[PDB]
Design an enzyme around this catalytic site. Structure first.
Site, PDB file in Angstrom:
ATOM      1  N   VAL A   1      -8.711 -11.043   3.896  1.00 59.09           N
ATOM      2  CA  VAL A   1      -9.296  -9.669   4.001  1.00 59.09           C
ATOM      3  C   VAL A   1      -9.026  -8.920   2.692  1.00 59.09           C
ATOM      4  CG1 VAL A   1      -8.783  -9.705   6.496  1.00 59.09           C
ATOM      5  CG2 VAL A   1      -7.318  -8.388   4.965  1.00 59.09           C
TER       6      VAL A   1
ATOM      7  N   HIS B   1      -0.938  -0.808  -4.465  1.00 56.06           N
ATOM      8  CA  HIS B   1      -1.048  -1.588  -3.214  1.00 56.06           C
ATOM      9  C   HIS B   1      -1.973  -0.804  -2.304  1.00 56.06           C
ATOM     10  CE1 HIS B   1       0.200  -4.389  -0.079  1.00 56.06           C
ATOM     11  NE2 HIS B   1       0.574  -3.363   0.683  1.00 56.06           N
ATOM     12  N   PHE B   2      -2.953  -1.483  -1.727  1.00 57.07           N
ATOM     13  CA  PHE B   2      -3.831  -0.891  -0.704  1.00 57.07           C
ATOM     14  C   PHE B   2      -3.174  -1.164   0.649  1.00 57.07           C
ATOM     15  CE2 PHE B   2      -7.275  -0.191   2.122  1.00 57.07           C
ATOM     16  CZ  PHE B   2      -7.942   0.839   1.508  1.00 57.07           C
ATOM     17  N   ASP B   3      -2.741  -0.149   1.381  1.00 57.52           N
ATOM     18  CA  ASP B   3      -1.929  -0.398   2.590  1.00 57.52           C
ATOM     19  C   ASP B   3      -2.859  -0.468   3.802  1.00 57.52           C
ATOM     20  OD1 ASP B   3       0.912  -1.018   3.173  1.00 57.52           O
ATOM     21  OD2 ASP B   3       0.854   0.797   4.450  1.00 57.52           O
TER      22      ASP B   3
ATOM     23  N   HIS C   1      -9.191  -3.759  -5.871  1.00 55.25           N
ATOM     24  CA  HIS C   1      -9.526  -2.680  -4.898  1.00 55.25           C
ATOM     25  C   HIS C   1     -10.485  -1.619  -5.401  1.00 55.25           C
ATOM     26  CE1 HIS C   1      -6.857  -4.404  -2.148  1.00 55.25           C
ATOM     27  NE2 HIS C   1      -5.860  -4.301  -2.999  1.00 55.25           N
TER      28      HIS C   1
ATOM     29  N   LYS D   1       3.310   0.363   5.844  1.00 60.01           N
ATOM     30  CA  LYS D   1       3.382  -0.720   6.866  1.00 60.01           C
ATOM     31  C   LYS D   1       4.681  -1.532   6.712  1.00 60.01           C
ATOM     32  CE  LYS D   1      -1.577  -1.244   7.769  1.00 60.01           C
ATOM     33  NZ  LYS D   1      -2.761  -2.136   7.695  1.00 60.01           N
TER      34      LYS D   1
ATOM     35  N   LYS E   1      -8.632 -15.430   0.054  1.00 62.59           N
ATOM     36  CA  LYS E   1      -7.942 -14.195   0.521  1.00 62.59           C
ATOM     37  C   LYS E   1      -8.607 -13.800   1.833  1.00 62.59           C
ATOM     38  CE  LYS E   1      -6.477  -9.528  -0.980  1.00 62.59           C
ATOM     39  NZ  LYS E   1      -6.323  -8.623  -2.147  1.00 62.59           N
TER      40      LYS E   1
HETATM   41 PT   LIG Z   1       1.699  -4.837  -3.675  1.00 56.93          PT
HETATM   42 PT   LIG Z   2      -4.270  -5.639  -2.651  1.00 56.15          PT
HETATM   43 PT   LIG Z   3       0.421  -4.566   2.382  1.00 53.64          PT
END
Ligand SMILES: [Pt+2]
Ligand SMILES: [Pt+2]
Ligand SMILES: [Pt+2]
Ligand SMILES: [Cl-]
Ligand SMILES: [N]
Ligand SMILES: [N]
Ligand SMILES: [N]
Ligand SMILES: [N]
Ligand SMILES: [N]
Ligand SMILES: [N]
Ligand SMILES: [Pt+2]
Ligand SMILES: [Pt+2]
Ligand SMILES: [Pt+2]
Ligand SMILES: [Pt+2]
Ligand SMILES: [Pt+2]
Ligand SMILES: [Pt+2]
Ligand SMILES: [Pt+2]
Ligand SMILES: [Pt+2]
Ligand SMILES: [Pt+2]
Ligand SMILES: [Pt+2]
Lengths: 121, 120
Positions: free
Chosen positions: B39, B115-117, B12, B62, B37
């Protein structure tokens, strides 16, 4: 709309004051240099739970004469940010000052949390 | 043994050039290894600026967890979106550049993005 509790967290909480450039980066990151250079601002370097707990500590008058202000029993790590005499928007420049001081906050709402930074003592 | 923070930085963080950008980055960052992957989002900001988001606006993740944070300021991001013609192992990526608020999940001591949400 941003709630008063949210605005307090955005302007005054730094739960992650390191370097002379802290206030420059932080005042930007918190949208406090968007329209104008906010001249003075304090960041509290404590956990959100520890700052929220001030609302059950020493009840005091606020600067404006309301009686919903609270003084922290303990000193807390704070960073005072204050705009330089030479600072001119949009080139906002701040002096960073680290201290361990009592904070005074105004508490409101449910949950009953800080909504206003009154002072450090 | 790659850490969750290390995994977030690889997937990311890029401290959009062209329509190429995504094709190379998704391959270069090992995202297309086991499968295309679908997206991925790359944040073009300093590691300092993205780690600072773990102290910004607390929001629901999410997945219903409570450890997500939204940036107060918009940040420059690249959305990489897999194409129809994209077939493993020849993964192909549409490159979309935006200035958006990011939402990250943070964990650990120190408290860092893992984590990118979402982007908003
Ligand atoms: Pt994660
Ligand atoms: Pt990710
Ligand atoms: Pt996620
Ligand atoms: Cl702390
Ligand atoms: N907000
Ligand atoms: N505030
Ligand atoms: N007091
Ligand atoms: N105040
Ligand atoms: N104190
Ligand atoms: N926003
Ligand atoms: Pt700190
Ligand atoms: Pt007293
Ligand atoms: Pt004291
Ligand atoms: Pt207020
Ligand atoms: Pt304030
Ligand atoms: Pt005040
Ligand atoms: Pt970039
Ligand atoms: Pt940023
Ligand atoms: Pt917001
Ligand atoms: Pt916005």
């Amino acid at each position: 709309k941003e709630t008063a509790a949210a605005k307090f967290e955005r302007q005054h909480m730094d739960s992650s004051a390191s370097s002379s450039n802290y206030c420059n980066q932080m005042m930007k990151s918190r949208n406090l240099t968007k329209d104008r250079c906010k001249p003075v601002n304090t960041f509290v370097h404590e956990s959100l739970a520890d700052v929220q707990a001030v609302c059950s500590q020493k009840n005091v008058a606020c600067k404006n004469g309301q009686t919903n202000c609270y003084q922290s029993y303990s000193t807390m790590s704070i960073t005072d940010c204050r705009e330089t005499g030479s600072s001119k928007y949009p080139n906002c420049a701040y002096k960073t000052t680290q201290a361990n001081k009592h904070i005074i906050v105004a508490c409101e709402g449910n949950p009953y949390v800080p909504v206003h930074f009154d002072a450090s003592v």
